[PDB]
Design a protein around this ligand. Sequence first.
Ligand code: HEM
Ligand SMILES: NCCc1c[nH]cn1
Length: 184
Amino acid sequence: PGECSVNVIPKKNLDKAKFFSGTWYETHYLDMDPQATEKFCFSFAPRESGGTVKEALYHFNVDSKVSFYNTGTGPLESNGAKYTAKFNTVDKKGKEIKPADEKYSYTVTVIEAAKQSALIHICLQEDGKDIGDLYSVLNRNKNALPNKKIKKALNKVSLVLTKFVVTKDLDCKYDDKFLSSWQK
Ligand code: HEM
Ligand SMILES: NCCc1c[nH]cn1
């Protein structure tokens, strides 16, 4: 199965205003499907208001040199560090080019955040059933290494950073303006 990981614990008392601001770059990622070996770059701009998350997502396929843009929207859990979103497909100007498919959703858990670093987990689902998951280390700076608090969080769940794919070595292309201008 594409069963999502157990023991994914939301950070206690995440600072929402700090986390749900600016642009986050994935610096390391671990797709829990060992055969998912396509190289990707990822960045996003998550925002929150009134218990609803609205985020802009950017992916770049290094293997194919194709980029794609999505937006996701959903309720933030009472714990304040986990949300489940439905997503559509937009172009680089933010115009919807494909509507959200009702059967798909994803659940983001913010496991840890420290300084300019964060660690999230994403469980993808179809009709409310797991179809795969991934962990990502995030940083405000593409070239930066994670704060040690991130490693501690990985270590609590028997993961080590060396298992992760490192992105700075990849030939990434980013659309930073798409994310900078999110909700502007
Ligand atoms: C951090 C490293 C990440 C990597 C390496 C990654 C990789 C991928 C890959 C390989 C796909 C499939 C693309 C294809 O079908 O051609 C994908 C799709 C997608 N991912 Fe990610 N992802 C990451 C993070 C995230 C995060 C954090 C979110 C949500 C907050 C997210 C949401 C999505 C969405 C909405 C799609 C489109 C699915 C569809 O079109 O059916 N991803 N990503
Ligand atoms: N194993 C989950 C893959 C993925 C891609 N994008 C988001 N999640």
